[PDB]
């Protein structure tokens, strides 16, 4: 997608990261595991929640069809009425489907962007003392131990 | 030693569409279109609809004898009428400005039927003889219960000068009619006089009806015609009736009690013994979705109607295989 | 030594909304919705509206004596009429196809009233006696100044055969009327004849009016009724009048001068002594914004109406705290 | 936001940069100060100006309500007229509010993107002979003096 | 040694617009708006339109003698009528509920004209004399070929009691008329009787017409008026005619064969001897584009109409100079 | 544009790359030339094709004007009919023009993004053993020969 991380340079997602949308996988002498990045996950939750509520709200003033009847010699006005009611429904159907299509794309991209920014945040911290593998991972020049790993996640490294 | 950045996958099978790509599998999604209903006609917020069954709005209001079930109806939430009700206008004819009356009715939740001109009046004219075999009740020739077909007494049809004052607070729907016999001989037989009229007046109405005699097809074995008129009589106003024949006269009229929110919905369904906050002609909806695709014509706290078959928003991200 | 990349902040407090985030503070913004008006009715581009005040379009055109202020009106930009004008139709009745006339009027900026049938004519019939106490002027019984209520002379009402040719270039609005008395005795008293008619003909019109006698509620102490008709007489066409009673006859008619852009706006406001390029029923707008939210019904070079309370575009960037 | 610079790896804006939307802060032995990048600021001005004019123009053919009157027995058509006029106004209100919402997001992101591209332009020039701090700043390995600073800004460095 | 990443350029001159930038030159583009037509009226899918030429829908159906070309018309795809057809209603008058008939006609592809009341009938009344110089054929005074203007025989106009049964499967369009003479003397001369009527009845229709006598402008040298009425006679129904003068009587009526998809389009164009799948009042379209900007009113498999002058999508990328 | 590659750090396109939208130019002792990157070009073709088909489909349920006639004393309803038909046409004209404007921008940006991601893919592979020039090009520390070049293009380098 637009930002190149999701199903791009990071080949696929993690079944094993269960507690968040984005996070870290670490691996060292003491072991290995997953940690959700809570701040970016929460930012994403708010954005997506607000988006859904914005979409619902903007669409709560759609056209409401009203029953209306006509006799045998009021055909022109009956037809006018019909084409008017259907006209609006077609406009609102289009509006709804398009907004969903377009915003679905914006949501996928937003996630992709959140992942790339999280990746850059770590790349900017690590700098020289790690090898950028090209697949989402950094391989440390120095031994890195759980508390070292923690400092990368919490943004206070080196 | 190695640290990696990554994102969530799961066993989700949910799919969303985008402009450039259809059926993208996502980790989470929110469906926003209600597609289900219950197939029943229900009370709206505790309030039963008026279900006309086999009666038309005309048959009900005029009091077609086949529509006795609706002699006295409590407050309704909405009215249900079939597409082609059999029990309408038992004696053939027309109902003048019918659709404008239907429209008026869609903004009314309660009628209260009161007597305005008693049958046991009309000392001059015969009231108990205005009956047809096309409007039967219990095997006998009967007629619309709310209007009186007046006939000559002792071969006399003296000019009628009758009037009613609306003492009530509430607007009053008043219905009357005229009979169009099919030849000169029927005129004399029903009414002695050859050239007749019905004149109706209120503060706004300036009416003069004249029977149109002519030969026409037998409809349900009848060649005569009835033509019904109505007005809304404002409170403190009076309606003036003057006629020397063909007068189908008010017995009962409707007090307009409620002026509630309403519609006449067209449905073949019968009462479902349920309650709902949102009713369609095809069934009721119970949903917190913002959209539905059931039917355009709803009443109550309803989602917005769209013609889509599917509306699903992505919330999560692209689920990897 | 160090070089940094960065972006502008300021003391801006301006806020904009996005899909994912409400009230984002931005360095610069452009508001595009006009929310203010001046609360007055003004001239449009130098051209004063016709403000009817307490008169209706009917009262004005027929020449209700209470509407003398509008005896001769200059070109207007638009017309203003109250929701419920008191001075309409001083003698009770109806104005036939009134709304289609109002509609026609909304595409007219100037009338020029000319005399077509003089009062000092009608040697056969009485013209100075057709006056009612319901239409007073200076404490005296008067009547619509543009039409003449003709009454019998010496107990005679000879058939009238009168006609007018439209010599003018311009289309002519012509108004006439019929009186509906409330009983047989009033007919003879006003008009000797018992059964009457008014026939009107032009190249397109084929009219025959007949008075409808009946008892009706007293409206402003009156039981009679007037019913007014109109036509647009094409240039070089002639209108043919024939009647033997109940004829309310043209004295004056309106030349259609302008055929300008216009509307009848409904407003309780009076003239404000101002000028504007954009007028609403609630006040005038002076703005370069593309939208406004004042009222749907405007005239002039106006912004587009929306129902929003707020429309603000970001131009600058997210202002940091 | 999507591009990660504004209120991302660059923590906040500059009250002291008064003459442009994006620019540079330098700091060396001779002193320190701000310089707007005129080319990208001007590109942004054009884009934003064009956008506002595009938005106004597309909306200058909205529906105009027209006064229309009906008698007591023309209720159905009166109501038809009302629901038609209101129907359009609801469509145009929605169109206007949504376009503003969506384009507001595109504008914020565009600024963010302009900042990131300006940052990358300098990173690509500086290369090895400076330390990428992770916060918008580059710290020079060699002493950098006003004319050195100037060559970074004007794109002709090394 | 060096490797570079890059993107395609070409000699393309194609330009697209964006929100922030107009006329961006792109390597590839897809235009989606059809701007061309062929300027002709064509057959739709092999099926020739009915081109009325100088006749109106009224002139055609009533059988204006100037409209002989349309005596018997095959199935059409759509109907074409000029804005102001000269050959309409040769004898002045009106066509009652004309627009509701036009509307009905727009959902009809084939008529089949059958005789319902023969001219060589009416032994009592003169049928061959109802002719006017305003409706000429070959220099002689003629009249609408589908209706018969009945006149007195031997100074007698006996009451007419005639009826027709719809034996056919198909709905039948039936047309009749009434003559409005311009004075008392014309009445007697055409019809002996002074006070006349035409009564028409079916199962739904309850009509009684009465001639309106009055003086009116000469239109094409004529002061009389014709007024034409119509009904749709359901199969197995019967129409009852009764009159003692002024009756313009059915000779021929139209069987409604097809009930196809159709429109009456307004165009000054004549037949173009071509075929198309999409026709506009200005010319035919042959396109695979989803939009066009030719005319709003089309028939066939058509692109969607927009008011744009230009709709071009980018497919490729920004072409470098 | 948003992603900074097209007419950004890559100054202009290649007349000489004829067989694809994005690709590589190589230059070494044996010679020089262009190679389209088939995978990203094909991804772009699908996206753009789908977009065009989505746009056409969403717009195939527009309002269809219907001929309707009125007499001299039905002016109000005639005008109602006219303002209704024109109202819809104005809505659909707006919908069509806006969708084209907005999606045209998304298409340009998508191309820009495809180019940037292709560039990053190569940067991530090359790492240290090449000099990032700042203009789309990488200059090798080691001699690179056609089969070496091939391994960069096919993603299997080093
Ligand atoms: C998307 O998947 C659905 C399954 O629900 C299928 O019916 C549809 O044809 C698919 N569309 C495309 C274009 O792949
Ligand atoms: C019309 O003619 C048919 C054929 O006999 C008949 O059955 C039908 O009843 C007639 N219509 C009426 C009204 O009788
Ligand atoms: C945004 O700020 C306005 C202040 O004008 C406030 O009224 C509104 O409630 C706020 N909305 C949200 C959701 O924060
Ligand atoms: C109707 O009756 C009331 C009650 O007396 C009366 O005041 C009112 O005037 C009557 N209506 C008319 C038209 O007089
Ligand atoms: C874009 O180019 C067209 C040439 O077809 C020109 O007419 C138009 O004025 C140009 N618009 C702008 C704003 O550059
Ligand atoms: C009306 O008067 C003009 C002026 O003489 C005349 O030419 C015209 O024919 C008249 N109208 C009619 C119907 O004759």
Residue numbers in the entry:
A (entry chain F), D (entry chain F), F (entry chain F): 1 to 158
B (entry chain E), C (entry chain E), E (entry chain E): 5 to 325
The authors write:
However, a prerequisite for efficient transmission of avian viruses between humans is a change from preferential recognition by the virus hemagglutinin (HA) of α2-3-sialyl-galactose-terminating host cell receptors, predominant in avian respiratory and gastrointestinal epithelia, to those terminating in α2-6-sialyl-galactose, which predominate in the human upper respiratory tract. Thus to better understand the nature and significance of such adaptive changes, it is essential to monitor HA changes that may affect receptor specificity of avian influenza viruses, particularly during human infection. The effects of the single amino acid substitutions in the HA on receptor binding were also studied by X-ray crystallography of HAs in complex with pentasaccharides possessing terminal sialic acid (Sia) linked to galactose (Gal) by either α2-3 (LSTa) or α2-6 (LSTc) linkage.
Introduction of a more bulky Val134 side-chain in the mutant, in place of the highly conserved Ala134 in wild type HA, increases the width of the hydrophobic channel between the 130- and 220-loops that form the front and left edges of the receptor-binding site. As a consequence, the H-bond between Gln222 and Ser132 is not formed in the mutant. The distances between Gln222 and the glycosidic-linkage O and between Gln222 and the 4-OH of Gal-2 are also slightly increased; as a consequence, the H-bonds formed between Gln222 and LSTa are weaker and Gal-2 was not readily discernible. The crystallographic structure of the HA–receptor complexes provided an explanation for the poor receptor binding by the Ala134Val mutant HA, namely that distortion of the binding site by the bulkier valine residue would potentially cause a reduction in the strength of H-bonds between receptor and binding site. The consequent increased width of the site is more akin to that of human H3 (and H9) viruses with their preference for α2-6-sialyl receptors. These observations are consistent with the comparative binding data obtained with the wild type H5 and the Glu186Asp and Ala134Val mutant recombinant viruses. Detailed analyses of the binding properties of the recombinant viruses containing the Ala134Val substitution, observed in virus isolated from a fatal case of H5N1 infection after 4 days of illness, showed consistently that binding to α2-3-sialyl sequences was reduced, but with no detectable increase in binding to the repertoire of α2-6-sialyl sequences examined.
